């Protein structure tokens, strides 16, 4: 029906067919992501005898994805029990913060490795290519500071919203208002998408015009740059387009009738799982590749 949130008249339902498809999806995600991220972190922690900036950034990406998919199982249980998150108040804040901060970190580090590749390919002699490991550590800590600085507001709020008989633990909710959460999601998709697309296009154009693509290994690198672009789009475009659609019908129509939302809600959360695929799809493209 129509619920109520302070200063925000919201309406989010508990429709079925969300506990039969989403829990198995999240189970597969957690299994594969935990396995891949553990087998990736094993090399970095123990049997990697070198480092440098690019491996620093890949290690940070793996750390972010690892924390994300260890955060997954509680969210999986929350989906299983049909929005009945019966853990408390601190667990809600922690899980929402973990999910959002780790997604921001994954996206920011994807963008930064794309920019690193763009500098390494189009401007090989730029001073940013020759960057010290301490400088890389400072830059990565600064990036983590930027990531956290936009997300601590999920710790101040009372996340476990009690309504009717249920305890909602969802940061993504639809309300007749604009908050920094939705806007941050919008830029989270758009601006890194623009940077990644520009970097990939410039890399491809410079490599092809240099006519060095004839090498049997450059072709694999090009196809994996393309692959990383397409997987980024595949995991991030659906949820964002559903958010744009719900913004459109919220602006045009409003919240007078709450029954024009059901569909645009349900698939939304399903699309919301697509980005978690990135966590379980990053190891195959980023680390396990490039022999
Ligand atoms: O941040 C997320 O991905 C999220 C937020 C609320 C509910 N489910 C997932």
PDB file of C-alpha atoms and ligand atoms in Angstrom:
ATOM      1  CA  UNK A   1       0.000   0.000   0.000  1.00  0.00           C
ATOM      2  CA  UNK A   2       1.099   3.570   0.784  1.00  0.00           C
ATOM      3  CA  UNK A   3       3.617   3.811   3.627  1.00  0.00           C
ATOM      4  CA  UNK A   4       5.078   6.919   5.270  1.00  0.00           C
ATOM      5  CA  UNK A   5       8.589   8.218   5.961  1.00  0.00           C
ATOM      6  CA  UNK A   6       9.341  11.474   7.778  1.00  0.00           C
ATOM      7  CA  UNK A   7       9.256  14.392   5.309  1.00  0.00           C
ATOM      8  CA  UNK A   8       9.204  11.804   2.467  1.00  0.00           C
ATOM      9  CA  UNK A   9       5.944  10.134   1.414  1.00  0.00           C
ATOM     10  CA  UNK A  10       7.313   6.822   0.112  1.00  0.00           C
ATOM     11  CA  UNK A  11       5.723   3.590  -1.094  1.00  0.00           C
ATOM     12  CA  UNK A  12       7.745   0.366  -1.411  1.00  0.00           C
ATOM     13  CA  UNK A  13       6.023  -3.016  -1.493  1.00  0.00           C
ATOM     14  CA  UNK A  14       6.904  -6.602  -0.549  1.00  0.00           C
ATOM     15  CA  UNK A  15       5.727  -8.330  -3.715  1.00  0.00           C
ATOM     16  CA  UNK A  16       6.387 -12.032  -4.236  1.00  0.00           C
ATOM     17  CA  UNK A  17       8.671 -13.615  -6.864  1.00  0.00           C
ATOM     18  CA  UNK A  18      11.459 -11.748  -5.058  1.00  0.00           C
ATOM     19  CA  UNK A  19      12.318 -14.673  -2.750  1.00  0.00           C
ATOM     20  CA  UNK A  20      12.503 -17.301  -5.518  1.00  0.00           C
ATOM     21  CA  UNK A  21      14.790 -15.717  -8.136  1.00  0.00           C
ATOM     22  CA  UNK A  22      16.891 -13.242  -6.143  1.00  0.00           C
ATOM     23  CA  UNK A  23      18.123 -15.606  -3.360  1.00  0.00           C
ATOM     24  CA  UNK A  24      19.530 -18.216  -5.794  1.00  0.00           C
ATOM     25  CA  UNK A  25      21.089 -15.442  -7.874  1.00  0.00           C
ATOM     26  CA  UNK A  26      22.778 -13.986  -4.793  1.00  0.00           C
ATOM     27  CA  UNK A  27      23.889 -17.450  -3.694  1.00  0.00           C
ATOM     28  CA  UNK A  28      25.644 -18.064  -6.996  1.00  0.00           C
ATOM     29  CA  UNK A  29      27.139 -14.568  -6.800  1.00  0.00           C
ATOM     30  CA  UNK A  30      28.448 -15.115  -3.275  1.00  0.00           C
ATOM     31  CA  UNK A  31      29.918 -18.542  -4.079  1.00  0.00           C
ATOM     32  CA  UNK A  32      31.741 -17.497  -7.239  1.00  0.00           C
ATOM     33  CA  UNK A  33      32.783 -14.079  -5.942  1.00  0.00           C
ATOM     34  CA  UNK A  34      34.184 -15.420  -2.676  1.00  0.00           C
ATOM     35  CA  UNK A  35      36.057 -18.194  -4.487  1.00  0.00           C
ATOM     36  CA  UNK A  36      37.514 -15.920  -7.159  1.00  0.00           C
ATOM     37  CA  UNK A  37      38.419 -13.132  -4.746  1.00  0.00           C
ATOM     38  CA  UNK A  38      40.060 -15.536  -2.303  1.00  0.00           C
ATOM     39  CA  UNK A  39      42.099 -17.164  -5.057  1.00  0.00           C
ATOM     40  CA  UNK A  40      43.031 -13.681  -6.290  1.00  0.00           C
ATOM     41  CA  UNK A  41      44.051 -12.321  -2.878  1.00  0.00           C
ATOM     42  CA  UNK A  42      46.129 -15.458  -2.284  1.00  0.00           C
ATOM     43  CA  UNK A  43      48.632 -14.383  -4.951  1.00  0.00           C
ATOM     44  CA  UNK A  44      48.819 -10.750  -3.831  1.00  0.00           C
ATOM     45  CA  UNK A  45      49.277 -11.649  -0.166  1.00  0.00           C
ATOM     46  CA  UNK A  46      51.712 -14.550  -0.567  1.00  0.00           C
ATOM     47  CA  UNK A  47      53.140 -15.381  -4.001  1.00  0.00           C
ATOM     48  CA  UNK A  48      53.384 -12.003  -5.775  1.00  0.00           C
ATOM     49  CA  UNK A  49      57.054 -10.995  -5.756  1.00  0.00           C
ATOM     50  CA  UNK A  50      56.468  -7.622  -7.471  1.00  0.00           C
ATOM     51  CA  UNK A  51      53.967  -4.784  -7.125  1.00  0.00           C
ATOM     52  CA  UNK A  52      53.905  -1.315  -8.756  1.00  0.00           C
ATOM     53  CA  UNK A  53      50.944   1.022  -9.145  1.00  0.00           C
ATOM     54  CA  UNK A  54      48.727  -1.079 -11.413  1.00  0.00           C
ATOM     55  CA  UNK A  55      48.919  -4.114  -9.136  1.00  0.00           C
ATOM     56  CA  UNK A  56      48.312  -1.806  -6.159  1.00  0.00           C
ATOM     57  CA  UNK A  57      45.076  -0.637  -7.774  1.00  0.00           C
ATOM     58  CA  UNK A  58      44.062  -4.184  -8.717  1.00  0.00           C
ATOM     59  CA  UNK A  59      44.665  -5.265  -5.115  1.00  0.00           C
ATOM     60  CA  UNK A  60      42.430  -2.442  -3.897  1.00  0.00           C
ATOM     61  CA  UNK A  61      39.741  -3.493  -6.378  1.00  0.00           C
ATOM     62  CA  UNK A  62      39.972  -7.076  -5.115  1.00  0.00           C
ATOM     63  CA  UNK A  63      39.725  -5.882  -1.502  1.00  0.00           C
ATOM     64  CA  UNK A  64      36.600  -3.875  -2.321  1.00  0.00           C
ATOM     65  CA  UNK A  65      34.925  -6.752  -4.155  1.00  0.00           C
ATOM     66  CA  UNK A  66      35.921  -9.196  -1.400  1.00  0.00           C
ATOM     67  CA  UNK A  67      34.330  -7.075   1.312  1.00  0.00           C
ATOM     68  CA  UNK A  68      31.289  -6.697  -0.943  1.00  0.00           C
ATOM     69  CA  UNK A  69      30.675 -10.406  -1.447  1.00  0.00           C
ATOM     70  CA  UNK A  70      31.282 -11.173   2.213  1.00  0.00           C
ATOM     71  CA  UNK A  71      28.591  -8.545   2.781  1.00  0.00           C
ATOM     72  CA  UNK A  72      26.302 -10.382   0.323  1.00  0.00           C
ATOM     73  CA  UNK A  73      25.043 -13.311   2.484  1.00  0.00           C
ATOM     74  CA  UNK A  74      23.217 -11.133   5.019  1.00  0.00           C
ATOM     75  CA  UNK A  75      21.520  -9.274   2.164  1.00  0.00           C
ATOM     76  CA  UNK A  76      20.657 -12.671   0.679  1.00  0.00           C
ATOM     77  CA  UNK A  77      18.947 -13.671   3.925  1.00  0.00           C
ATOM     78  CA  UNK A  78      17.122 -10.331   4.014  1.00  0.00           C
ATOM     79  CA  UNK A  79      15.768 -11.020   0.532  1.00  0.00           C
ATOM     80  CA  UNK A  80      14.899 -14.594   1.534  1.00  0.00           C
ATOM     81  CA  UNK A  81      12.731 -13.552   4.467  1.00  0.00           C
ATOM     82  CA  UNK A  82      10.838 -11.008   2.284  1.00  0.00           C
ATOM     83  CA  UNK A  83      12.182  -7.729   3.689  1.00  0.00           C
ATOM     84  CA  UNK A  84      12.214  -9.014   7.281  1.00  0.00           C
ATOM     85  CA  UNK A  85      15.731  -8.027   8.322  1.00  0.00           C
ATOM     86  CA  UNK A  86      15.626  -9.132  11.971  1.00  0.00           C
ATOM     87  CA  UNK A  87      19.158  -8.289  13.114  1.00  0.00           C
ATOM     88  CA  UNK A  88      19.008  -4.864  14.761  1.00  0.00           C
ATOM     89  CA  UNK A  89      20.051  -1.295  13.991  1.00  0.00           C
ATOM     90  CA  UNK A  90      23.857  -1.397  13.829  1.00  0.00           C
ATOM     91  CA  UNK A  91      23.725  -4.336  11.335  1.00  0.00           C
ATOM     92  CA  UNK A  92      21.533  -2.305   8.959  1.00  0.00           C
ATOM     93  CA  UNK A  93      23.889   0.674   9.001  1.00  0.00           C
ATOM     94  CA  UNK A  94      26.887  -1.604   8.565  1.00  0.00           C
ATOM     95  CA  UNK A  95      25.432  -3.606   5.679  1.00  0.00           C
ATOM     96  CA  UNK A  96      24.143  -0.593   3.739  1.00  0.00           C
ATOM     97  CA  UNK A  97      27.437   1.224   4.295  1.00  0.00           C
ATOM     98  CA  UNK A  98      29.401  -1.847   3.211  1.00  0.00           C
ATOM     99  CA  UNK A  99      27.359  -2.344   0.042  1.00  0.00           C
ATOM    100  CA  UNK A 100      27.382   1.308  -1.030  1.00  0.00           C
ATOM    101  CA  UNK A 101      31.013   2.037  -0.107  1.00  0.00           C
ATOM    102  CA  UNK A 102      32.215  -1.150  -1.806  1.00  0.00           C
ATOM    103  CA  UNK A 103      30.213  -0.419  -4.957  1.00  0.00           C
ATOM    104  CA  UNK A 104      31.638   3.107  -5.018  1.00  0.00           C
ATOM    105  CA  UNK A 105      35.122   1.689  -4.519  1.00  0.00           C
ATOM    106  CA  UNK A 106      34.684  -0.867  -7.291  1.00  0.00           C
ATOM    107  CA  UNK A 107      33.482   1.828  -9.692  1.00  0.00           C
ATOM    108  CA  UNK A 108      36.157   4.374  -8.708  1.00  0.00           C
ATOM    109  CA  UNK A 109      38.950   1.814  -9.003  1.00  0.00           C
ATOM    110  CA  UNK A 110      37.562   0.609 -12.333  1.00  0.00           C
ATOM    111  CA  UNK A 111      37.688   4.219 -13.512  1.00  0.00           C
ATOM    112  CA  UNK A 112      41.200   4.704 -12.139  1.00  0.00           C
ATOM    113  CA  UNK A 113      42.551   1.548 -13.792  1.00  0.00           C
ATOM    114  CA  UNK A 114      40.894   2.673 -17.032  1.00  0.00           C
ATOM    115  CA  UNK A 115      42.604   6.063 -16.701  1.00  0.00           C
ATOM    116  CA  UNK A 116      45.883   4.317 -15.878  1.00  0.00           C
ATOM    117  CA  UNK A 117      45.573   2.237 -19.046  1.00  0.00           C
ATOM    118  CA  UNK A 118      44.693   5.355 -21.043  1.00  0.00           C
ATOM    119  CA  UNK A 119      47.848   7.083 -19.811  1.00  0.00           C
ATOM    120  CA  UNK A 120      49.919   3.940 -20.382  1.00  0.00           C
ATOM    121  CA  UNK A 121      48.673   3.561 -23.975  1.00  0.00           C
ATOM    122  CA  UNK A 122      47.995   7.013 -25.427  1.00  0.00           C
ATOM    123  CA  UNK A 123      50.645   8.986 -23.475  1.00  0.00           C
ATOM    124  CA  UNK A 124      53.375   6.426 -22.740  1.00  0.00           C
ATOM    125  CA  UNK A 125      55.994   9.035 -21.807  1.00  0.00           C
ATOM    126  CA  UNK A 126      53.792  10.944 -19.351  1.00  0.00           C
ATOM    127  CA  UNK A 127      55.262  11.290 -15.869  1.00  0.00           C
ATOM    128  CA  UNK A 128      52.127   9.747 -14.353  1.00  0.00           C
ATOM    129  CA  UNK A 129      53.117   6.379 -15.840  1.00  0.00           C
ATOM    130  CA  UNK A 130      56.320   6.369 -13.753  1.00  0.00           C
ATOM    131  CA  UNK A 131      54.687   6.740 -10.336  1.00  0.00           C
ATOM    132  CA  UNK A 132      56.223   5.526  -7.082  1.00  0.00           C
ATOM    133  CA  UNK A 133      54.604   2.833  -4.959  1.00  0.00           C
ATOM    134  CA  UNK A 134      54.333   5.167  -1.962  1.00  0.00           C
ATOM    135  CA  UNK A 135      52.628   7.737  -4.196  1.00  0.00           C
ATOM    136  CA  UNK A 136      50.261   5.025  -5.418  1.00  0.00           C
ATOM    137  CA  UNK A 137      49.460   4.122  -1.809  1.00  0.00           C
ATOM    138  CA  UNK A 138      48.736   7.771  -0.969  1.00  0.00           C
ATOM    139  CA  UNK A 139      46.554   8.149  -4.074  1.00  0.00           C
ATOM    140  CA  UNK A 140      44.652   4.962  -3.239  1.00  0.00           C
ATOM    141  CA  UNK A 141      44.101   6.035   0.373  1.00  0.00           C
ATOM    142  CA  UNK A 142      42.851   9.379  -0.956  1.00  0.00           C
ATOM    143  CA  UNK A 143      40.477   7.550  -3.308  1.00  0.00           C
ATOM    144  CA  UNK A 144      39.197   5.482  -0.389  1.00  0.00           C
ATOM    145  CA  UNK A 145      38.730   8.742   1.506  1.00  0.00           C
ATOM    146  CA  UNK A 146      36.654  10.142  -1.347  1.00  0.00           C
ATOM    147  CA  UNK A 147      34.677   6.887  -1.481  1.00  0.00           C
ATOM    148  CA  UNK A 148      33.885   6.902   2.238  1.00  0.00           C
ATOM    149  CA  UNK A 149      33.283  10.653   2.486  1.00  0.00           C
ATOM    150  CA  UNK A 150      30.159  10.433   0.322  1.00  0.00           C
ATOM    151  CA  UNK A 151      28.743   7.381   2.115  1.00  0.00           C
ATOM    152  CA  UNK A 152      29.035   7.926   5.891  1.00  0.00           C
ATOM    153  CA  UNK A 153      25.570   9.505   5.790  1.00  0.00           C
ATOM    154  CA  UNK A 154      24.233   5.937   5.660  1.00  0.00           C
ATOM    155  CA  UNK A 155      25.635   5.431   9.177  1.00  0.00           C
ATOM    156  CA  UNK A 156      23.872   8.411  10.773  1.00  0.00           C
ATOM    157  CA  UNK A 157      20.355   7.440   9.691  1.00  0.00           C
ATOM    158  CA  UNK A 158      18.258   4.826  11.480  1.00  0.00           C
ATOM    159  CA  UNK A 159      18.378   2.320   8.637  1.00  0.00           C
ATOM    160  CA  UNK A 160      16.103  -0.441  10.089  1.00  0.00           C
ATOM    161  CA  UNK A 161      12.785   1.187   9.205  1.00  0.00           C
ATOM    162  CA  UNK A 162       9.982  -0.578  11.072  1.00  0.00           C
ATOM    163  CA  UNK A 163       6.667  -0.616   9.203  1.00  0.00           C
ATOM    164  CA  UNK A 164       3.563  -2.711   9.792  1.00  0.00           C
ATOM    165  CA  UNK A 165       5.308  -5.972  10.610  1.00  0.00           C
ATOM    166  CA  UNK A 166       8.515  -5.656   8.602  1.00  0.00           C
ATOM    167  CA  UNK A 167      11.996  -4.228   9.185  1.00  0.00           C
ATOM    168  CA  UNK A 168      13.246  -2.642   5.969  1.00  0.00           C
ATOM    169  CA  UNK A 169      17.028  -2.547   5.463  1.00  0.00           C
ATOM    170  CA  UNK A 170      17.141  -1.009   1.984  1.00  0.00           C
ATOM    171  CA  UNK A 171      19.036   2.185   1.214  1.00  0.00           C
ATOM    172  CA  UNK A 172      17.481   2.368  -2.270  1.00  0.00           C
ATOM    173  CA  UNK A 173      13.878   3.472  -1.795  1.00  0.00           C
ATOM    174  CA  UNK A 174      11.432   5.480  -3.900  1.00  0.00           C
ATOM    175  CA  UNK A 175      10.141   8.701  -2.348  1.00  0.00           C
ATOM    176  CA  UNK A 176       8.650  11.957  -3.627  1.00  0.00           C
ATOM    177  CA  UNK A 177      11.879  13.810  -2.872  1.00  0.00           C
ATOM    178  CA  UNK A 178      15.471  14.172  -4.037  1.00  0.00           C
ATOM    179  CA  UNK A 179      18.267  12.944  -1.770  1.00  0.00           C
ATOM    180  CA  UNK A 180      22.013  12.633  -2.215  1.00  0.00           C
ATOM    181  CA  UNK A 181      21.617   8.844  -2.501  1.00  0.00           C
ATOM    182  CA  UNK A 182      19.773   8.867  -5.838  1.00  0.00           C
ATOM    183  CA  UNK A 183      21.928  11.654  -7.272  1.00  0.00           C
ATOM    184  CA  UNK A 184      25.104   9.894  -6.187  1.00  0.00           C
ATOM    185  CA  UNK A 185      23.850   6.748  -7.926  1.00  0.00           C
ATOM    186  CA  UNK A 186      23.177   8.770 -11.089  1.00  0.00           C
ATOM    187  CA  UNK A 187      26.663  10.295 -11.239  1.00  0.00           C
ATOM    188  CA  UNK A 188      28.095   6.944 -10.076  1.00  0.00           C
ATOM    189  CA  UNK A 189      26.866   5.513 -13.345  1.00  0.00           C
ATOM    190  CA  UNK A 190      27.250   8.476 -15.696  1.00  0.00           C
ATOM    191  CA  UNK A 191      30.578  10.138 -14.907  1.00  0.00           C
ATOM    192  CA  UNK A 192      32.632   6.917 -14.587  1.00  0.00           C
ATOM    193  CA  UNK A 193      30.780   5.622 -17.654  1.00  0.00           C
ATOM    194  CA  UNK A 194      31.863   8.683 -19.611  1.00  0.00           C
ATOM    195  CA  UNK A 195      35.452   8.432 -18.400  1.00  0.00           C
ATOM    196  CA  UNK A 196      35.643   4.681 -19.074  1.00  0.00           C
ATOM    197  CA  UNK A 197      34.091   5.005 -22.538  1.00  0.00           C
ATOM    198  CA  UNK A 198      36.402   7.882 -23.471  1.00  0.00           C
ATOM    199  CA  UNK A 199      39.477   6.044 -22.182  1.00  0.00           C
ATOM    200  CA  UNK A 200      38.580   2.806 -23.975  1.00  0.00           C
ATOM    201  CA  UNK A 201      37.824   4.618 -27.237  1.00  0.00           C
ATOM    202  CA  UNK A 202      41.092   6.560 -27.084  1.00  0.00           C
ATOM    203  CA  UNK A 203      43.069   3.405 -26.283  1.00  0.00           C
ATOM    204  CA  UNK A 204      41.503   1.503 -29.179  1.00  0.00           C
ATOM    205  CA  UNK A 205      41.969   4.361 -31.645  1.00  0.00           C
ATOM    206  CA  UNK A 206      45.595   5.002 -30.670  1.00  0.00           C
ATOM    207  CA  UNK A 207      46.492   1.307 -30.779  1.00  0.00           C
ATOM    208  CA  UNK A 208      44.811   0.778 -34.154  1.00  0.00           C
ATOM    209  CA  UNK A 209      46.273   3.911 -35.749  1.00  0.00           C
ATOM    210  CA  UNK A 210      49.732   2.929 -34.501  1.00  0.00           C
ATOM    211  CA  UNK A 211      49.243  -0.305 -36.513  1.00  0.00           C
ATOM    212  CA  UNK A 212      50.761  -2.349 -33.673  1.00  0.00           C
ATOM    213  CA  UNK A 213      47.541  -4.361 -33.269  1.00  0.00           C
ATOM    214  CA  UNK A 214      48.935  -7.050 -35.599  1.00  0.00           C
ATOM    215  CA  UNK A 215      50.628  -8.672 -32.591  1.00  0.00           C
ATOM    216  CA  UNK A 216      48.913 -11.829 -31.365  1.00  0.00           C
ATOM    217  CA  UNK A 217      48.807 -10.534 -27.763  1.00  0.00           C
ATOM    218  CA  UNK A 218      47.653  -6.951 -28.420  1.00  0.00           C
ATOM    219  CA  UNK A 219      44.472  -8.425 -29.882  1.00  0.00           C
ATOM    220  CA  UNK A 220      43.704 -10.168 -26.581  1.00  0.00           C
ATOM    221  CA  UNK A 221      44.308  -6.942 -24.649  1.00  0.00           C
ATOM    222  CA  UNK A 222      42.013  -5.025 -27.008  1.00  0.00           C
ATOM    223  CA  UNK A 223      39.277  -7.641 -26.752  1.00  0.00           C
ATOM    224  CA  UNK A 224      39.520  -7.591 -22.959  1.00  0.00           C
ATOM    225  CA  UNK A 225      39.365  -3.787 -22.825  1.00  0.00           C
ATOM    226  CA  UNK A 226      36.215  -4.061 -24.923  1.00  0.00           C
ATOM    227  CA  UNK A 227      34.972  -6.868 -22.660  1.00  0.00           C
ATOM    228  CA  UNK A 228      35.471  -4.792 -19.517  1.00  0.00           C
ATOM    229  CA  UNK A 229      33.569  -1.917 -21.133  1.00  0.00           C
ATOM    230  CA  UNK A 230      30.651  -4.188 -22.042  1.00  0.00           C
ATOM    231  CA  UNK A 231      30.484  -5.856 -18.626  1.00  0.00           C
ATOM    232  CA  UNK A 232      30.522  -2.454 -16.929  1.00  0.00           C
ATOM    233  CA  UNK A 233      27.606  -1.428 -19.145  1.00  0.00           C
ATOM    234  CA  UNK A 234      25.768  -4.737 -18.653  1.00  0.00           C
ATOM    235  CA  UNK A 235      25.904  -4.594 -14.859  1.00  0.00           C
ATOM    236  CA  UNK A 236      25.248  -0.873 -14.445  1.00  0.00           C
ATOM    237  CA  UNK A 237      22.879   0.256 -17.230  1.00  0.00           C
ATOM    238  CA  UNK A 238      19.749  -1.730 -16.164  1.00  0.00           C
ATOM    239  CA  UNK A 239      19.364  -0.408 -12.614  1.00  0.00           C
ATOM    240  CA  UNK A 240      20.149   3.126 -13.767  1.00  0.00           C
ATOM    241  CA  UNK A 241      17.586   3.034 -16.570  1.00  0.00           C
ATOM    242  CA  UNK A 242      14.951   1.771 -14.134  1.00  0.00           C
ATOM    243  CA  UNK A 243      15.882   4.627 -11.786  1.00  0.00           C
ATOM    244  CA  UNK A 244      15.560   7.115 -14.656  1.00  0.00           C
ATOM    245  CA  UNK A 245      12.178   5.642 -15.581  1.00  0.00           C
ATOM    246  CA  UNK A 246      10.880   5.843 -12.020  1.00  0.00           C
ATOM    247  CA  UNK A 247      12.144   9.436 -11.807  1.00  0.00           C
ATOM    248  CA  UNK A 248      10.271  10.158 -15.042  1.00  0.00           C
ATOM    249  CA  UNK A 249       6.940   8.779 -13.826  1.00  0.00           C
ATOM    250  CA  UNK A 250       7.464  10.368 -10.397  1.00  0.00           C
ATOM    251  CA  UNK A 251       7.930  13.796 -11.988  1.00  0.00           C
ATOM    252  CA  UNK A 252       5.104  13.416 -14.507  1.00  0.00           C
ATOM    253  CA  UNK A 253       2.555  11.594 -12.330  1.00  0.00           C
ATOM    254  CA  UNK A 254       3.575  11.699  -8.664  1.00  0.00           C
ATOM    255  CA  UNK A 255       2.708   9.499  -5.699  1.00  0.00           C
ATOM    256  CA  UNK A 256      -1.071  10.021  -5.782  1.00  0.00           C
ATOM    257  CA  UNK A 257      -1.539   6.367  -6.782  1.00  0.00           C
ATOM    258  CA  UNK A 258       1.062   3.872  -5.577  1.00  0.00           C
ATOM    259  CA  UNK A 259      -0.074   0.966  -7.783  1.00  0.00           C
ATOM    260  CA  UNK A 260       1.704   2.286 -10.904  1.00  0.00           C
ATOM    261  CA  UNK A 261       5.028   1.281  -9.347  1.00  0.00           C
ATOM    262  CA  UNK A 262       4.918  -2.503  -8.786  1.00  0.00           C
ATOM    263  CA  UNK A 263       6.716  -3.594 -11.950  1.00  0.00           C
ATOM    264  CA  UNK A 264       9.175  -0.700 -11.952  1.00  0.00           C
ATOM    265  CA  UNK A 265      10.046  -1.656  -8.381  1.00  0.00           C
ATOM    266  CA  UNK A 266      10.462  -5.421  -8.713  1.00  0.00           C
ATOM    267  CA  UNK A 267      12.787  -5.695 -11.706  1.00  0.00           C
ATOM    268  CA  UNK A 268      14.674  -2.717 -10.269  1.00  0.00           C
ATOM    269  CA  UNK A 269      16.047  -4.791  -7.409  1.00  0.00           C
ATOM    270  CA  UNK A 270      16.757  -7.625  -9.843  1.00  0.00           C
ATOM    271  CA  UNK A 271      18.694  -5.134 -11.951  1.00  0.00           C
ATOM    272  CA  UNK A 272      20.297  -4.059  -8.677  1.00  0.00           C
ATOM    273  CA  UNK A 273      21.903  -7.503  -8.483  1.00  0.00           C
ATOM    274  CA  UNK A 274      23.545  -7.056 -11.885  1.00  0.00           C
ATOM    275  CA  UNK A 275      26.235  -4.794 -10.435  1.00  0.00           C
ATOM    276  CA  UNK A 276      27.146  -7.536  -7.953  1.00  0.00           C
ATOM    277  CA  UNK A 277      27.967  -9.637 -11.021  1.00  0.00           C
ATOM    278  CA  UNK A 278      30.864  -7.230 -11.511  1.00  0.00           C
ATOM    279  CA  UNK A 279      32.345  -8.432  -8.219  1.00  0.00           C
ATOM    280  CA  UNK A 280      32.187 -12.026  -9.466  1.00  0.00           C
ATOM    281  CA  UNK A 281      33.190 -11.049 -13.024  1.00  0.00           C
ATOM    282  CA  UNK A 282      36.157  -8.794 -12.243  1.00  0.00           C
ATOM    283  CA  UNK A 283      38.593 -11.661 -11.403  1.00  0.00           C
ATOM    284  CA  UNK A 284      38.309 -13.327 -14.816  1.00  0.00           C
ATOM    285  CA  UNK A 285      38.905 -10.114 -16.790  1.00  0.00           C
ATOM    286  CA  UNK A 286      41.272  -8.146 -14.567  1.00  0.00           C
ATOM    287  CA  UNK A 287      43.617 -10.570 -12.773  1.00  0.00           C
ATOM    288  CA  UNK A 288      43.340 -14.054 -14.283  1.00  0.00           C
ATOM    289  CA  UNK A 289      43.821 -12.603 -17.777  1.00  0.00           C
ATOM    290  CA  UNK A 290      46.827 -10.779 -19.293  1.00  0.00           C
ATOM    291  CA  UNK A 291      49.398 -13.634 -19.248  1.00  0.00           C
TER     292      UNK A 291
HETATM  293  O1  LIG B   1      23.306  -0.874  -2.054  1.00  0.00           O
HETATM  294  C1  LIG B   1      22.655  -1.837  -2.532  1.00  0.00           C
HETATM  295  O2  LIG B   1      23.109  -2.470  -3.517  1.00  0.00           O
HETATM  296  C2  LIG B   1      21.317  -2.227  -1.922  1.00  0.00           C
HETATM  297  C3  LIG B   1      20.624  -1.327  -1.191  1.00  0.00           C
HETATM  298  C4  LIG B   1      19.433  -1.671  -0.648  1.00  0.00           C
HETATM  299  C5  LIG B   1      18.927  -2.944  -0.840  1.00  0.00           C
HETATM  300  N1  LIG B   1      19.622  -3.842  -1.569  1.00  0.00           N
HETATM  301  C6  LIG B   1      20.810  -3.499  -2.111  1.00  0.00           C
END
